[PDB]
Amino acid sequence: DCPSGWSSYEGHCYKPFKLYKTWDDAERFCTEQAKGGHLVSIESAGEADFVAQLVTENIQNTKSYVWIGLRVQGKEKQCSSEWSDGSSVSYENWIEAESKTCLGLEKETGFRKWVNIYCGQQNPFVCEA
Amino acid sequence: DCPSDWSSYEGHCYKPFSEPKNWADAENFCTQQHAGGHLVSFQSSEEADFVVKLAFQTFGHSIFWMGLSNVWNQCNWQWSNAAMLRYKAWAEESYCVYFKSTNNKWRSRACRMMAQFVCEFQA
Ligand SMILES: [Cl-]
Ligand SMILES: [Rb+]
Ligand SMILES: [Rb+]
């Protein structure tokens, strides 16, 4: 059934938020919206369709990405041990925002494609319980 | 000492190229320009500075491949709801590191895309 405000799809409840937050504030925010709440996880094409549809009709005029729950867990700028010449990787000089280890959907690709983006960005999202 | 078409800097020879190639083709190409050739790697701030300066003096405003590939593919990607990662819908499969001729900051770009690049070899 799902609570007023949430929409149902094969056993789960979803709710889009046109709120701008970092991946971490979003995920935490989602946990506070429902028991067992998290940023939306997409485990099938049918579910991906259902999410794209929800985003299309509810998150507009934001010119941003839409947070999904898939990301690299740690805070590393990367997970590469050596350069192509075999030498070890020590020195590193990343622009904070150039390390894109979080995923978000975008209007351009019909909110059906996962784009690598900086977790520090402040984008809208969708929660799922 | 280095070949006349290359530029030396602390026991290493460097050379930028204009023909755009995806990361894989650039690296491989480098291996064919001189024994032990590969895409440039940065072990220090001064070395990177030298390479940036060279790239700019050579081609001006542009972007060049660095010797780092599939940088986040080995990271641990997972759903915050702890669901098994099975269905995939990636816009891009892998990212590679490059730098722009104006500064030594590391930036990211899909490995399948194209860019200019710098090759390098030791002694
Ligand atoms: Cl990780
Ligand atoms: Rb409902
Ligand atoms: Rb790091």
Swiss-Prot record, chain A:
This protein's record includes keyword Ribonucleoprotein: no
Domain C-type lectin: 1-129
Annotated localization: Secreted
Molecular function as annotated in GO: calcium ion binding; toxin activity
Disulfide cysteine pairs (residue numbers): C2-C13, C30-C127, C102-C119
Tissues/organs with expression: Expressed by the venom gland.
Residue numbers binding Ca(2+): S41, E43, E47, E128
PANTHER family given in the database record: MANNOSE, PHOSPHOLIPASE, LECTIN RECEPTOR RELATED
Subunit structure, interactors included: Heterodimer of subunits A and B; disulfide-linked.
Role according to the record: Anticoagulant protein which binds to the gamma-carboxyglutamic acid-domain regions of factor IX (F9) (but not factor X) in the presence of calcium with a 1 to 1 stoichiometry.
Family under the similarity heading: Belongs to the snaclec family.
Protein name, per record: Snaclec coagulation factor IX-binding protein subunit A
The species this protein was found in: Protobothrops flavoviridis
Swiss-Prot record, chain B:
Domain of life of the organism encoding this protein: Eukaryota
Molecular function terms from GO: calcium ion binding; toxin activity
The entry's keywords: Blood coagulation cascade inhibiting toxin, Calcium, Disulfide bond, Hemostasis impairing toxin, Metal-binding, Secreted, Signal, Toxin
Positions with a binding annotation for Ca(2+): S41, Q43, E47, E120
Subunit-structure text: Heterodimer with subunit A of IX/X-bp or IX-bp; disulfide-linked.
Recorded family membership: Belongs to the snaclec family.
Protein name stated in the entry: Snaclec coagulation factor IX/factor X-binding protein subunit B
Species name: Protobothrops flavoviridis (Habu)
Phylogenetic placement of the source organism: Eukaryota, Metazoa, Chordata, Craniata, Vertebrata
Span of the entire protein shown here: 24 to 146 of 146
